[PDB]
Structures are given as structure tokens and as C-alpha cells.
Design an enzyme around this catalytic site. Structure first.
Site, short mmCIF file in Angstrom:
data_model
loop_
_atom_site.label_atom_id
_atom_site.label_comp_id
_atom_site.label_asym_id
_atom_site.label_seq_id
_atom_site.Cartn_x
_atom_site.Cartn_y
_atom_site.Cartn_z
N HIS A 47 -18.75 5.79 58.81
CA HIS A 47 -19.96 5.42 58.07
C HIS A 47 -20.46 4.04 58.53
O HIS A 47 -21.66 3.82 58.63
CB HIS A 47 -19.78 5.51 56.55
N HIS A 95 -18.54 -5.67 56.38
CA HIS A 95 -19.17 -4.60 57.15
C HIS A 95 -20.70 -4.82 57.08
O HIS A 95 -21.17 -5.68 56.32
CB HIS A 95 -18.82 -3.21 56.63
N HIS A 127 -24.79 -2.75 57.29
CA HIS A 127 -25.68 -1.61 57.26
C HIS A 127 -26.87 -1.96 58.16
O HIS A 127 -27.32 -3.12 58.12
CB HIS A 127 -26.17 -1.32 55.83
N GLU A 150 -30.19 -2.83 52.72
CA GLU A 150 -30.02 -2.07 51.47
C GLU A 150 -30.84 -2.74 50.37
O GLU A 150 -31.79 -2.14 49.83
CB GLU A 150 -28.53 -1.97 51.14
N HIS A 154 -22.26 -7.34 54.26
CA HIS A 154 -21.57 -7.35 52.98
C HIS A 154 -20.14 -7.89 53.19
O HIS A 154 -19.34 -7.26 53.89
CB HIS A 154 -21.48 -5.93 52.41
N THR A 190 -22.31 0.54 47.26
CA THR A 190 -23.49 1.26 47.77
C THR A 190 -23.13 2.53 48.57
O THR A 190 -24.02 3.20 49.10
CB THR A 190 -24.42 0.37 48.58
N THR A 191 -21.83 2.84 48.66
CA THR A 191 -21.33 4.10 49.22
C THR A 191 -20.46 4.77 48.17
O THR A 191 -19.87 4.09 47.30
CB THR A 191 -20.48 3.86 50.47
ZN LIG Z 1 -22.02 -2.37 52.20
#
Ligand SMILES: [Zn+2]
EC number: 4.2.1.1
Length: 257
Positions: A61, A91, A93, A103, A116, A195-196
Site C-alpha cells: 500500500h 510513510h 501518500h 490526504e 505521516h 487513514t487505512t
Molecule cells: Zn498515512
């Protein structure tokens, strides 16, 4: 089999994770005309001088840069927080195009990416117990825009070829996360979620106002990663972001006037 594809993306997550439609979901849009300055907020304390990075992992992901969290080595305190929060991983996005990828949004503006830095509250003893608590995690979110290169990011960029596909990891010691921070620590804060999946409502969000800049070449290397495993048809790891969720009965507070 949740993901970010045509048939398993964010709009489908609620079927396996009903909290997706919950009261405190993340990310959110930050409206700078209604977030209110809070004089009770204390300055943020980012204490990363003794951080011990260990490994980088493509989890299918995103990729996680993992830290030793078995002692108070890299901690977040102050700000809106009570107590001490230990860094476990960071990590990102990011998008397929420079106009999308974050996000959180700011007055509906999407940044090219979002970092993040994930921390857990040491009063709960381990990460898996912390995620079951409303005040279990603190996530420092930092926006990325495309412009000048970020020198402190290049060691991450250069290892990505070794973790191209899902399930690959590589040693990643002696990385300094202070090189990913902007100049100012001015922030917005609100209560929200991962958020996942599993989308747990355990996070105090601290989103920095000032973005960092990364180069077009750096982002292009992010976009060469794969969602798939080795020997499978190639699916580029792009557009691994969840869109903004309803604010509901929450207020966003600003540390700055
Ligand atoms: Zn994140």
C-alpha cells in the site's frame, strides 16, 4: 483485499470496515477561515536526536521506514498532547500527478504528497494496545509540494529500487527524520483516525502549516514503486491516498495567530 484500485478503493472500504462511516474519520479538509487559534495549546516538542531507524518495507500500500520503539529514543510531546509518544514508523501518500496525492487538504487544496510520522502513547505499553484507545496515537502530518529537492529525503529515494514490489524489505539504519521537517512547527490539530484499514479512531492529528519541497525527480522515483508482488503484472504504486471525510462534530484548532 482493500486497496486504491478501480474495484477496491476507499469508497468500498466500509463493507469490510464499517467505522469508515464513523464520527471521527480522517483525513479532513482544513478550512483556514474557521480553524480558531487556541492559546491553551503548548509548543510542540519533537525530540528525534536519538532516533534508531532499522528497516524499510514495501507493504503493498505504501512503504514504511521503521524505528526501534522499545525505549524513549524518538518522541513527540507538548502541543495538544499529554504524555509521551514514541515514533514507530513513517510513510507517505502520493499521486500520479503533481496536483493530487495528499490526504488532508487546506481550503480544498491538494498537495503532491503527505508524510505521516506515526507515534504511540507510552502509557499503553505497545502499539497494538494503543490503537484501541482514543488517545493512543499522535500522527505528525507534513505536506509535500514539487519544487526544489529535499536533501534529507534522497537516502529514502535511493533505496526504493531494492523494495520495488510488495513484501520486499531492506536494511535502513542511521536515517535522521529531522531532515524531513520544515522550518516552522506551527500546526493545526484535531481528533481523528488511521487513514487505512482498520480506520481506528485513535489519533490526535498534528498537521504542519508549512510544506516541504521535493524535486520532480524525487517524486518520479516514488511513482516507480509497485503495488504488486514480484513476478506479478505491474501495477504502479500511485494515488495511494484517501480523500477528505466529513468533519462532523469536531473543531480544528490552530497553534498560531
Ligand atoms: Zn498515512
Amino acid at each position: 483485499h482493500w486497496g486504491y484500485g478501480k474495484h477496491n478503493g476507499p469508497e468500498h472500504w466500509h463493507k469490510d470496515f464499517p467505522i469508515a462511516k464513523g464520527e471521527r474519520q480522517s483525513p479532513v479538509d482544513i478550512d483556514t477561515h474557521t480553524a480558531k487559534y487556541d492559546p491553551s495549546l503548548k509548543p510542540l516538542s519533537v525530540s528525534y536526536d536519538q532516533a534508531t531507524s532499522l528497516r524499510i518495507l514495501n507493504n503493498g500500500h505504501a512503504f514504511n521506514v521503521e524505528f526501534d520503539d522499545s525505549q524513549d529514543k524518538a518522541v513527540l510531546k507538548g502541543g495538544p498532547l499529554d504524555g509521551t509518544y514514541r515514533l514507530i514508523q513513517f510513510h507517505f501518500h502520493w499521486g500520479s500527478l503533481d496536483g493530487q496525492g495528499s490526504e488532508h487538504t487546506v481550503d480544498k487544496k491538494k498537495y503532491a504528497a503527505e508524510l505521516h510520522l506515526v507515534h504511540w502513547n507510552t502509557k499503553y505499553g505497545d502499539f497494538g494496545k494503543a490503537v484501541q484507545q482514543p488517545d493512543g496515537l499522535a500522527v505528525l502530518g507534513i505536506f509535500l509540494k514539487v519544487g526544489s529537492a529535499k536533501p534529507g529525503l534522497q537516502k529514502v529515494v535511493d533505496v526504493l529500487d531494492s523494495i520495488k514490489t510488495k513484501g520486499k524489505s531492506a536494511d535502513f539504519t542511521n536515517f535522521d527524520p529531522r531532515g524531513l521537517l520544515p522550518e516552522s512547527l506551527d500546526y493545526w490539530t484535531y481528533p481523528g483516525s488511521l487513514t487505512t484499514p482498520p480506520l481506528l479512531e485513535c489519533v490526535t492529528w498534528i498537521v504542519l502549516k508549512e510544506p516541504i519541497s521535493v524535486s520532480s525527480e524525487q517524486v518520479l522515483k516514488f511513482r516507480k514503486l509497485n503495488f504488486n508482488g514480484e513476478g506479478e503484472p505491474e501495477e504502479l504504486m500511485v494515488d495511494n491516498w484517501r480523500p477528505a471525510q466529513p468533519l462532523k462534530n469536531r473543531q480544528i484548532k490552530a497553534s498560531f495567530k
